[PDB]
Each structure stands twice: as C-alpha cells, then as structure tokens.
Design a binder for this molecule. Sequence first.
Ligand SMILES: NC(=O)C1=CN([C@@H]2O[C@H](COP(=O)(O)OP(=O)(O)OC[C@H]3O[C@@H](n4cnc5c(N)ncnc54)[C@H](OP(=O)(O)O)[C@@H]3O)[C@@H](O)[C@H]2O)C=CC1
Ligand SMILES: NC(=O)C1=CN([C@@H]2O[C@H](COP(=O)(O)OP(=O)(O)OC[C@H]3O[C@@H](n4cnc5c(N)ncnc54)[C@H](OP(=O)(O)O)[C@@H]3O)[C@@H](O)[C@H]2O)C=CC1
Ligand SMILES: O=P(O)(O)Cc1ccc(-c2ccccc2)cn1
Ligand SMILES: O=P(O)(O)Cc1ccc(-c2ccccc2)cn1
Lengths: 398, 400
Amino acid sequence: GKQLTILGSTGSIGCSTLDVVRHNPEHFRVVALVAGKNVTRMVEQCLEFSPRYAVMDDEASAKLLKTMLQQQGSRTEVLSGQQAACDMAALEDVDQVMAAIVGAAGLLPTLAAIRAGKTILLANKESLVTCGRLFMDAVKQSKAQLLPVDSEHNAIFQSLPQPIQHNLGYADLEQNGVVSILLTGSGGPFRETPLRDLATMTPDQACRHPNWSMGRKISVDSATMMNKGLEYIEARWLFNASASQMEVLIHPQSVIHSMVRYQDGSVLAQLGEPDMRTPIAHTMAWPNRVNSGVKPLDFCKLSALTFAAPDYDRYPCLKLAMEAFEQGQAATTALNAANEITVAAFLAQQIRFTDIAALNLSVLEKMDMREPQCVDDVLSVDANAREVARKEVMRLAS
Amino acid sequence: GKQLTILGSTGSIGCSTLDVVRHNPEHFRVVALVAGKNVTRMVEQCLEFSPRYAVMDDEASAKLLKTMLQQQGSRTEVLSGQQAACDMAALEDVDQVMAAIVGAAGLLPTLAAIRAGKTILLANKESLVTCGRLFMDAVKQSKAQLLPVDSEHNAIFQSLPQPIQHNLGYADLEQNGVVSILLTGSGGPFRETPLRDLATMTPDQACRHPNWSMGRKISVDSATMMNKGLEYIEARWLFNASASQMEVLIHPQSVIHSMVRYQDGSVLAQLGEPDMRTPIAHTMAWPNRVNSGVKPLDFCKLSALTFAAPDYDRYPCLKLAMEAFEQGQAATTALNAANEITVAAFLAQQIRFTDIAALNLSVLEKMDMREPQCVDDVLSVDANAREVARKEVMRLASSA
Ligand SMILES: NC(=O)C1=CN([C@@H]2O[C@H](COP(=O)(O)OP(=O)(O)OC[C@H]3O[C@@H](n4cnc5c(N)ncnc54)[C@H](OP(=O)(O)O)[C@@H]3O)[C@@H](O)[C@H]2O)C=CC1
Ligand SMILES: NC(=O)C1=CN([C@@H]2O[C@H](COP(=O)(O)OP(=O)(O)OC[C@H]3O[C@@H](n4cnc5c(N)ncnc54)[C@H](OP(=O)(O)O)[C@@H]3O)[C@@H](O)[C@H]2O)C=CC1
Ligand SMILES: O=P(O)(O)Cc1ccc(-c2ccccc2)cn1
Ligand SMILES: O=P(O)(O)Cc1ccc(-c2ccccc2)cn1
C-alpha cells in the first residue's frame, strides 16, 4: 500500500491518522512515527502499527521508549532529536508524510519532506503561516504534492478542478475557471454578543464554543476569528489566490466546510460531519477514497444553514491577518507568534478578551522586520515577536 | 472553437444556450439550429448566429423560413423534417449537440448524436426517462460523452470524480469512492399543506410555486414530486446507481442543486443562482469554464437552508417513479406518458390534484407490455399508455 511517515503521531491529528490506517490496514503501512515526549502513547502506537522507526524529539523520552519497547519485545528502532525526525520525513521508500508536528518545531521536518519530493499531508500551521513563500518555492522546486489536512483547506481542495489539485500552489486560478475561494468560519461563541460586552468576556466563556469543544488556544482563536485569519494566510499561499480571489464568510453551523466559486456561476462545496478523519482519509487516499469511520452526514438532523459577512469591528484579528499577509512573511510570523503570547495571557487572566487584538496590533506596529529568506530568519522573527508581545502584556497588566 | 448543433434552439434551453454562445463568440460556432414551428425566433437566431443549416420539423414552417432568410440575405440552408434533424445531430464537423427538443420527438435526434459519438449536452427528459437502457448501451458502444444539462444532474456531475465524469454511464460508483447520489427537490407549493386538503387544490394553486416561476406542467410535477421521480429514473441510468445508492431530499430553498456522498464521509455539492445558463455553460466548456452571464450567488442574501425526507403519503408519484424503475423502461415510459395526460386533465379541471397519482398508478396496473428493445417499441408503449390514461380520465370525469 502506501508507506507513511507520521510526524507528530501522538497528538490529535496523529491519532486520527492512525485511526484511518486502522480502518485500512491493507492500504497503508506505517514506516515511521515521530513525536515529542508522550512515551506512553508512542509505545502503544509502536505495538499496534509495527513501524521500522520511532523517533522522540526529547532524548530522555527516546531512552525511556527504547526500554519499554524492549520490555515489550518490540524491535522497532528508537531514534531521538531533530535530525532523525527530518530523516524519517525523507526516507527513500516512504510515499506520504503526515506533517502534524505543532508549532515552529514542525518546520524543518516538514521542509525535509518537501525537499524529498514526498506527498505531504499538511497539518502544521506554521508551515504556510510563517514559511508560505519559502515552502511554496521549495514545493515547485521538488514537485512535492501538498494535500491540505485542515478542514477548510481540504474542503477547498476537494472543490477545485483537477489541474489545480495537481500543481497545487502554482496553477493559475483564473485560467482554470476559478473566481474565488470561499473560506467559512463559525464566528465563534461571541458572534451575537453586544460589542460593549466583549471587553468583559471570561476565558471560560471564550472557550465555551456553543457547538464543538476543542483546545483552549484554538477556541479563543475561533472567538477572535484569528483562526480564520491564519487560514486566510495559508489559503492564499496554498491556492495561489490574490486578495480579490478570497472571500471569508461566517457560517455558524459549520456544515459547509468551505467552497469554491466558478466563472459560470457554480459554487462547489464540501460538507460533512465535524470529524478530522474525513479530511485526513481524503488526503491519504487521494485521488481515490477510503472508509474513515466517520458516519454519513444526516441532512434531516441539521440546524438551518446560515451565512453572514464578518464584521471587522467584531473581529479585528481577521482584518489584522489579511493586512499582515500584504506586509509579508515577517508580519504573518510576528502576528502568529504575538497571538500565542496574547491568547495565553488572556487565558491566564492577565489581559482582557479585547486586549488580544489590541496587543497583536501593537506588536506588529512596533516591529517592522525584513522579509525572511530562510527558516532561521523566520525563527528569529518568531522569537523577537514573542518578546515584544510578552513586554506588551507585562506593561498592560503592570 | 467548438462547433455545435442546437436541437430545439427556439425553446427555453435553446435560447439560454445561445446566450452562452453570445458571451463566448470565440469559443463556440453554431453550425446548425433545429426547431419545430417557431419561425419568428428561428429567423432571429439565424441572422445573429449564421448557422450553416437550420431545420424546422414542420414543413410549412421550413418553407416560410427558407424565403425570409433568402430575403434578409442569410446564407443558411433551410431543411425540413425529422431525418434532417437527425442528420444535423450527426454532422461530421460538429463537436457538441445540445439536445433540447421536448417530448418523444427528442429521442431520434438525440440518439443520432449518440450513434455519431458526439458530446451530448443532454436536456431532453424522455431520453433517459423512457430509453435509459437503450441510450446508455448506445453511449457505451460509441463512447459518446454525455453532459447533463438539468440542474440536479449537472450538480451531481460536477460533484463526481474525474474517472466517473469521463466514463459517465459505465464507471462503477463504489470503486470510485462514491456511496450515494443525493437528489434535492423543492417539495413544491404543498410541502406543508394538510394531506386532506390536497384533493381540493386548484391548478392555479399548484402552479403558484411560492419561490419559483416555470411552465404549468413542470409546476404541477414539482407539486407532486413527479419531477423528482423522473429525475430519480434519469439519475440511476446516467450515474449507474442502484436503489441503495440514491437518496431524495427535500430542500425548499433550492440553493444546493444536488450532492454526492463519499466513502470517507465527505459530501460534495454544487450551489448557485437558479439560472439555467450555469449548467449549460458548464457542459459547453467542460473540462474548462466559461462566463455564462450568471451573477455570483450572494450568500448574505439567502434564506436559511433546510432539508427533510420526502413523505410518500404526501408524494405518491415519487414512490411510483422509484417502483416503475424496477419494472423497466416499459413502466417508466408508461408513467411518463400517463402523467402527461393526467397533469393536462388536472390543469383542464377534469380531475382533482390527487387524481394525478391515482390515475398514474391505475394506468401502470393496466399496462402489460414487454421491455422495449428499440426506440420504436418505446414510442408504442408511450402511444398506448396515453390512450389508457385518456380513458381513465374520461371514466373518472364522466362516470364513477
Ligand atoms: N487538531 C485539529 O483539528 C487541527 C490542527 N491543525 C494543526 O496541526 C498541527 C497538529 O495539531 P494537533 O494534532 O491538534 O496538535 P497536538 O498538540 O495534539 O499534537 C502535536 C504533536 O506534535 C508533537 N511534537 C511537539 N513538539 C515536537 C517536536 N519538537 N518534534 C517532534 N514532535 C513534536 C507532539 O508530541 P507529544 O504529544 O508526544 O509531545 C504531538 O504528537 C498543529 O500545527 C495544528 O495547528 C490543523 C488542522 C486541524
Ligand atoms: N426548461 C428547463 O429549465 C429544463 C428543461 N429540461 C428538458 O429539456 C427539454 C427542452 O426543454 P425546454 O427548452 O424548456 O422546452 P421548450 O418547450 O421551451 O422548447 C422545445 C424545443 O423543441 C422544439 N421542438 C418541438 N418539437 C420538435 C420537433 N418535432 N423537432 C424539432 N424540434 C422540436 C421547439 O421548437 P419550436 O418552439 O420552434 O416549435 C423548441 O425549440 C425538455 O425535455 C425538458 O424537460 C431539462 C432541464 C431543465
Ligand atoms: O471555523 P472556526 O470558527 O475557525 C473553528 C470551528 C468552530 C466551530 C465549529 C463547529 C463544529 C461543529 C458544529 C458547530 C461549530 C467548527 N470549527
Ligand atoms: O426541484 P423541483 O421542485 O422539481 C423544481 C424547482 C422548484 C422550485 C425551485 C426553486 C428555485 C429557486 C428558489 C426557490 C425554489 C427550483 N426548482
């Protein structure tokens, strides 16, 4: 079947990927698993999927893993550190690399897979949010096939014509009859909150998305629409879309995952149950399909589907992201880094809900760095933006 | 430059297709126009599009047209009759044939295109409602490309993978990751009417689709969901779908035109403004795209989108169509034919709204014909079913 390396196997996307393989043991062979510190989950995955290699970024973790796998009678070879992670991404015999490491740490292993011309199941945000120019250049250079895993981008990918799907990132949209890309977002828990009350929203209220339940960081990003802002940045790189070829639409029910508008009037959309196994199984099977374990969407048990235009007075972060894109990878990197700092401060009750957007702006205004030319440059912008952001939080809470 | 024949150029689909040509004069050349009796419309189209040929099915119409064009200095050659219509569909240099003749009259001209291996932009309902097996067998033999123009089928086509699109009729759904085809219908004006009030609904009520504005016959078919039943028949042929691979959903807003359900849980859908130029331009440009004149769908000005399962007590015609399919082309042809007669009788106030389903069933029960083996056989089932249906109407309008 297809030989796969899973980068970030022990996290949420990694576990969902392995559930797809579990459903399709004849179509997929796990060659390598890479993770950080979750030795316990990693052991269980090595014992189920029999990979050739298992890598832990953390050395103490790698040593403990080796001792457990030995105790358990497994001969999976245990490696450690960043170079081994990149090596697994570049293994000559692997076909697909699930790029699911979180944060800047996913950058070099992902680039290693790109440079190796692998099919990349891309689920690491920083890759296009921070390194969109560098990675799209590298993809063109190696002819690597990117298959986006995030629900929105995968929905768009499924709704795009074949010549774009092949050649993803270099194809011309207009030449292929595409007018625009329609990014849909829930609008978050404060979609209908009076604007006066936004300054007093609590972390528990912000993380209380009506319908979904997910991590606190992403819940807050959904409340600010920073999440859609970051997906805007990725979509422009992934789909070769100009600002006029992008539309953002609030869709509270999140049944339509995103859409593509065509020259003749047609709009194609992908819909489905809210379950990451669907987009993951799509990318793993492309251009064919596999069972993912996700149940068929029941159209008779849906809330009525509604749409609205995002109000930038309600979602300044969405506008900030759009503007940042225009300023370049230094601005997008700085925004993403600043946002991690301000959201964490919000969750720690150091700042108010509305201070997230205000301090994100403040960081971008204060900085002005030059366009990154390599991953080290991006890492540098990221580090500097966090420091500026932390000082801003301290001043404010000071 | 794609060379085309337009069968039924003077009708609604015909006019919409020439608007697409008008918007894209450098991508499409009109070689031949074919119609029935609308000499006036035909004259204008010939002056504007300069086809090599124009045919009218009606002989006097063809004669009237021949002179007017010679007068206005048109170089188009005017022919007449069905054989001429079929020859246009088979012209060696023609790339695409827009199959937009209404009724049993569209069968032989559409078939001529299929036998010629043409790309067919299929609009004519009778082609697959009555000759589904014959026509799909024919397209498989000549490797003709079918491109469905009807909104539902076109939406499904656009939501299907490339291996199915390019082998439409022959490809296996399952092997291509497709679990089912989701056909959406508005549910008509009586979607929420008390069942016991259906018997008293008037033609004007049935034809007053709250949200849509179309011909009287189609409006009644929308009210009974016979329209969806006919499309179910077409879809099973066109997409090679078994009964378990078909779903019918009521979607009152008709924004989603139909959908395709995949193995991984994904559902692909096509949405757009309710303008036939969209699906027409889709088929004309496929696998590429062209401007159609249709404005982008404004998602901020929509009614909330809803869905529901059809209740067969409310829509017995839908269920009759599904059952007819299982009995073969003799049954689907008889149902289509009986429904023409019973809808016309309802509209003429000879029978009740609810007598349409009742009499359609009664015709089907009285018919006992073999599977048709060629178009002529289908025409005979049609002729016979019409007469059975007329007598049922008269029995009901006269006696008990
Ligand atoms: N969750 C979702 O619905 C979606 C998430 N995304 C993106 O996908 C990526 C992964 O998300 P998710 O799976 O939710 O995140 P998780 O935090 O659940 O998992 C992250 C994975 O990365 C591993 N990891 C962390 N640091 C390193 C490192 N230095 N080297 C190697 N592995 C490391 C973790 O290992 P361990 O736990 O063992 O320490 C874990 O396996 C993120 O970038 C996220 O933004 C995109 C689309 C959808
Ligand atoms: N209207 C719609 O939105 C849709 C319609 N369809 C189907 O497409 C087909 C065409 O529909 P529509 O355009 O609305 O129908 P119309 O009634 O508007 O047009 C019918 C066309 O066929 C011509 N015609 C009739 N008899 C003959 C004949 N014997 N030989 C040659 N031409 C003939 C008419 O010519 P003339 O007027 O000159 O006499 C006219 O050009 C129908 O089967 C319909 O069910 C499918 C999907 C959508
Ligand atoms: O689209 P966003 O807002 O960035 C994140 C998000 C939030 C909610 C949902 C959602 C999922 C299921 C039901 C209702 C809402 C999906 N994604
Ligand atoms: O799907 P049906 O019911 O057979 C025909 C039909 C009726 C109404 C509509 C419709 C179109 C636009 C707005 C509201 C309803 C579309 N098609």
